[PDB]
């Protein structure tokens, strides 16, 4: 669906509350907590990240990964005001996942649920709906490509 500019503004703020810590510690725990919810629900996906060593949670090879994911999301949100660019990188973000053999359209809808369950716990005043709306628009375009 489409989303509304106000909602974007809502999120562009809601995020500034989760992101907000400067460096890694916080964002890590959150993005992690997100994935843990993805794996507890779609255990299958777990295997996909052996390349980054998920078997070693505190590895660092993996922590760094989490961050990259976080930052990749950050980059998206922080692009919501520049549509045209977002629309492109959003594609580029798809291609980076289409070439990743084993990534289903489902796993995405799954990580989406993840945030919607985690975020509301890491910060108050979370407009779950607004988030959900704009997150879906983002996911759809990411996922869609692969098919």
């Amino acid at each position: 669906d489409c989303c509304s500019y106000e909602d974007r503004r809502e999120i562009r703020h809601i995020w500034d509350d989760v992101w907000s810590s400067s460096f890694t510690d916080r964002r890590v725990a959150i993005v992690r907590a997100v994935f843990d919810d993805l794996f507890k629900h779609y255990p299958t996906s777990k295997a996909l990240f052996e390349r980054v060593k998920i078997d070693e949670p505190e590895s660092g090879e993996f922590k760094s990964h989490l961050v990259r994911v976080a930052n990749g999301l950050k980059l998206l949100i922080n692009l919501l005001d520049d549509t045209l660019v977002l629309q492109s990188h959003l594609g580029h973000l798809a291609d980076q996942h289409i070439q990743r053999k084993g990534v289903t359209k489902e796993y995405f809808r799954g990580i989406g649920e993840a945030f919607a369950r985690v975020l509301p716990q890491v910060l108050s005043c979370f407009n779950v709906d607004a988030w959900n709306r704009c997150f879906h628009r983002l996911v759809a375009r990411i996922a869609k490509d692969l098919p």
Partner: protein, 145 residues
Amino acid sequence: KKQCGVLEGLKVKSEWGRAYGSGHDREAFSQAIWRATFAQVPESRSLFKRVHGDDTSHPAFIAHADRVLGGLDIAISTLDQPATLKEELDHLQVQHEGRKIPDNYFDAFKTAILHVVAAQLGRCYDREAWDACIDHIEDGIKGHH
């Protein structure tokens, strides 16, 4: 109610940051809290006879108050990381054991904190969360069950 754990901690730790504040806001924040405490259990004034508990506005007490919140800060602040918190709590535990402390007062002091903090934060403030953590922090000071 609930018990402590990672998120509810981060929340309180953050909200406390806003409520605590600094400068005068602090000198008052504490002031308010104590007034709320003593108003609940006037009996307790007798314990702070050493630091002019009779007049909440006396510098000696002002210091005391600002000094107390100080610890509470370390507690909450440190809370988030179990390793360190553990230590601070343990440290406190010592400064207290051999003293028996009525659980009646701690209760009031918590209430005080909560009411003031709520007054200070306006709208963004989870009650249960604070209750849970202020509790965990107090338990660590009374130290006994």
